Symmetry: D2
Subunit: 107 residues, 4 copies
């Protein structure tokens, strides 16, 4: 239930051989602020989590240690999953179609 951002950031720092001032430089904050991230005394805003997730190639969920725990109709989930087979050109067309219809006929 409780996230573990401070523990995770501490382990990333260790495993990557980083110093707090290097992370501070990455996020444009004080080195002191990064110390407080690590100790859990203070937490970053969404923009800072995104910069860290991008740097370390992590999902935001992995970075903060967030985990969860139902579709009524599975053939819809199956259709949605099937969009991952489409080329980017075909997905681009579907996005225009759906955006257009939503603009013209707002639910």
């Amino acid at each position: 239930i409780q996230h573990q951002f401070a523990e995770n950031l501490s382990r990333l720092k260790k495993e990557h051989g980083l110093k707090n001032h290097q992370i501070a430089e990455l996020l444009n904050v004080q080195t002191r602020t990064v110390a407080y991230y690590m100790s859990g005394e203070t937490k970053p805003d969404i923009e800072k989590l995104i910069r860290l997730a991008t740097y370390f190639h992590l999902s935001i969920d992995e970075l903060v240690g967030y985990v969860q725990e139902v579709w009524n109709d599975l053939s819809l989930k199956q259709w949605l999953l099937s969009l991952n087979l489409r080329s980017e050109e075909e997905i681009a067309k579907i996005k225009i179609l759906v955006d257009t219809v939503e603009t013209l006929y707002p639910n």
Copy 2:
């Protein structure tokens, strides 16, 4: 590259028939602050993103619209993936083993 939290929160509000004050009550903030979330004028901290993701049953990545874009050795990835087959009782034992060894013999 740019997240779309404000757009996503706005669509969740619409599709769920929520009023800003209901979301405000959920997060223990002012209704005005929720208005600013929706317009993108201000962003929530990690604790507020987690409360929203939990409420709407979403990953934090889905909630904010974060997307990314390599293992050197795939048999390790394959091993890690294989842990998802294990019972919770067996994963609990592995966690104790690994935590213990890390405590005794800190890399």
Copy 3:
């Protein structure tokens, strides 16, 4: 690179306390055939993998130990990901829209 279905099925059998004849009954095959699955001498067809994945609540990828290893434009991936926020009723409408247009105007 090489899948590990036989190793995985063997570990599932062990961790669940199953006997080969119980798995055979699940798949409507001979107990001997299940023995050959476990030893890697023979592999199941897609229908049998789906029955096993469903029984054990696993992805087919997890069940067989399959792992992989690029979007040209990430805002499309981000849009696709955003569909996971939509209600089933709204996804159902999008599916009809897209299916209809594909039927009328086949790429």
Copy 4:
């Protein structure tokens, strides 16, 4: 509930501008057999699904249109998720530790 491998393979063939004989060459089967895959008259074995998923960069689940639908204790799931933060060198060590202990002291 019902997979959609034949529909998916048909759409991949279309979107990629492939001919059946090209897919046949990829899988080392007759062109006729690929025709039967597409019409759903016959299904490939796991080795052939893996070759297709690898070629098209898809999960096996995406390729066949398989979808599913609980952890008792979430802090274990959270620990397992946290392994994705580790370097490959550290995961390699954990794998040796766990494999060794399993070999010495078989549950």
